[PDB]
Amino acid sequence: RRCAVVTGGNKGIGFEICKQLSSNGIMVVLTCRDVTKGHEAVEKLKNSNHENVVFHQLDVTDPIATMSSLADFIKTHFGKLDILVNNAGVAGFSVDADRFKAMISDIGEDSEELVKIYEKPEAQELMSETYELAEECLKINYNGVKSVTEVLIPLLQLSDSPRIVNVSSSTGSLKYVSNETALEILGDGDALTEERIDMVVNMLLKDFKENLIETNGWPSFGAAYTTSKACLNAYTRVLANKIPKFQVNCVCPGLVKTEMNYGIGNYTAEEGAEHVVRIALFPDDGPSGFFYDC
Ligand SMILES: NC(=O)C1=CN([C@@H]2O[C@H](COP(=O)(O)OP(=O)(O)OC[C@H]3O[C@@H](n4cnc5c(N)ncnc54)[C@H](OP(=O)(O)O)[C@@H]3O)[C@@H](O)[C@H]2O)C=CC1
């Protein structure tokens, strides 16, 4: 049996990825940071007749040394890893829940309008981004992906067909990278390295902390998130180059109705996960280094 690790597996797209991989005969290690939430998710899938799922704790921001226990667990019970889905991620902003629920109620969750207004200024007024949230966003969406990937690479090396799928967003496209220095680094594909991508991340965090978002031409809203995904894409390309044995790709699942969006989206969680699972289960002869649907 092929086996998979999915990060952020307790809810949203991640939970549905675990369910669908399991449905396709994959042995799934559902990981997430909250132990109670993890056990409840696995119990829920079992009660749905998905038996090839097991829980293991994983907060992607923890030290890489702590992750050694996941690596050992997989080696001991499975002998290899075939699939890693880097799904865990956060938006980098909070919302006024009361007013957001009022806005959703008012419009009606349907009529493309709800999705339309979610992107209007009327909506941003209900959202708050802070340096604290930015720092966490980058640690989870970018650095966390690097740590989990580094720890599990030696197990993926043992697979005859290793795959890494990183869940990205189209807002991470270079078209939205406004800062000139960042655009220059991320757009110079031939010169991409992990170190240069780290520079972009550190540049953003430094400017954010020093209140230079507007001043240095960063996006006026959602700069942490969009930067984290643009850096995730670049890192995905670098990793693809470094490890030609692997399939390493990003997938942008479209706008999905999860708690990340307070239920707003074009696709259900099931549908979003389907988009990611189609790449995770590519034939053994598959491409690497690309950004699907981004
Ligand atoms: N929903 C959308 O429209 C889109 C989502 N994406 C990407 O899809 C991925 C999943 O998003 P989605 O399902 O919508 O969001 P959800 O908020 O519903 O789920 C997020 C998952 O990530 C977990 N998570 C958050 N921080 C950490 C951490 N430090 N360590 C381990 N797990 C963590 C959450 O755990 P917990 O329950 O403990 O908080 C949860 O399991 C993300 O990378 C997101 O950026 C890309 C394009 C569109």
Give the bridge partners for 199, in sequence order.
none
Q: For ligand 1, atom 40, which residue shows the shortest CA distance?
A: 8
Q: The sheet that has 291-292: what strands, in order across it? A: 53-57, 27-32, 3-6, 83-86, 163-167, 247-251, 291-292
Q: Is 160 annotated as a binding residue?
A: no
How far is residue 129's CA from residue 95's CA, in Å, rounded to a whole number? 9
Give the active site residue among 131, 225, 235, 262. 225
Structure tokens at 125: 């007024």
Place of tokens 């972009």: 200
How many domains are contained in the chain?
Answer: 1
Cα angle 156, 158, 162; round to 5: 40
Per-position b or e across 102-136, b if 16+ CB within 10 A of its CB: ebbeebeeeeeebbebbeeeebeebbebeeebbbe
For residue 136, which of 67, 199, 90 has the smallest C-alpha distance? Answer: 90
Structural domain for 28, as ranges: 1-294
Q: Between the CA of residue 145 and those of 6, 8, 203, what are the distances in Å?
A: 11, 11, 19
Measure 270 CA to ligand 1 centroid, in angstroms. 14
Cα angle 73, 163, 277; round to 5: 100
The backbone torsions φ and ψ at residue 57, rounded to the nearest 5 degrees and listed phi first, read: -65, 135
The DSSP 8-state label assigned to residue 92 in this structure reads S
Structure tokens at 32: 């997430």
How far is residue 164's CA from residue 290's CA, in Å, rounded to a whole number? 11
How far is residue 75's CA from residue 56's CA, in Å, rounded to a whole number? 13
For residue 148, which of 202, 203, 81 has the smallest C-alpha distance? Answer: 81
- CATH number reported for the structural domain that contains residue 212 in this entry: 3.40.50.720
Query: What residues are in contact with ligand 1 under a 6 Å CB criterion?
Result: 7-8, 10-14, 32-34, 37, 58-61, 87-90, 140, 167, 169, 252-253, 255-256, 258-261, 265
How far is residue 63's CA from residue 102's CA, in Å, rounded to a whole number? 40
Beta strand pairing status for 127-128 and 94-95?
Answer: antiparallel
Residue 226 backbone zone (phi > 0: left; psi -120 to 50: alpha; other: beta): alpha
How far is residue 199's CA from residue 216's CA, in Å, rounded to a whole number? 15
Measure 90 CA to ligand 1 centroid, in angstroms. 5
Measured from the Cα of 259, ligand 1's closest atom is 18
How far is residue 290's CA from residue 37's CA, in Å, rounded to a whole number? 33
End-to-end CA distance of the chain: 31
Q: For ligand 1, atom 2, which residue shows the shortest CA distance?
A: 256
Structural contact between residues 81 and 161, judged by C-beta atoms closer than 8 angstroms: no
Distance of CA 91 to the CA centre of its chain: 10
Structural contact between residues 87 and 17, judged by C-beta atoms closer than 8 angstroms: yes
Measure 88 CA to ligand 1 centroid, in angstroms. 4
Place of tokens 């690596």: 71
How far is residue 177's CA from residue 289's CA, in Å, rounded to a whole number? 20
- Resolution (angstroms) equals 1.9
Residue 116, CB half-sphere, CA atoms under 13 Å: how many? 6
Give the bridge partners for 247, in sequence order.
163
Answer yes or no: 267 catalytic: no
Q: Is 67 annotated as a binding residue?
A: no
- What single letter denotes the amino acid at residue 163? R
Task: State the Rg of the chain over Cα.
Answer: 19
Measure 25 CA to ligand 1 centroid, in angstroms. 24
167's CB contacts (< 8 A; 6+ apart) are 13, 85, 86, 87, 89, 250, 251, 252, 253, 276
How far is residue 281's CA from residue 274's CA, in Å, rounded to a whole number? 10
Cα angle 150, 152, 154; round to 5: 90
Experimental method: X-ray
Distance of CA 81 to the CA centre of its chain: 19
Measured from the Cα of 170, ligand 1's closest atom is 47
Q: Is 225 annotated as a binding residue?
A: yes
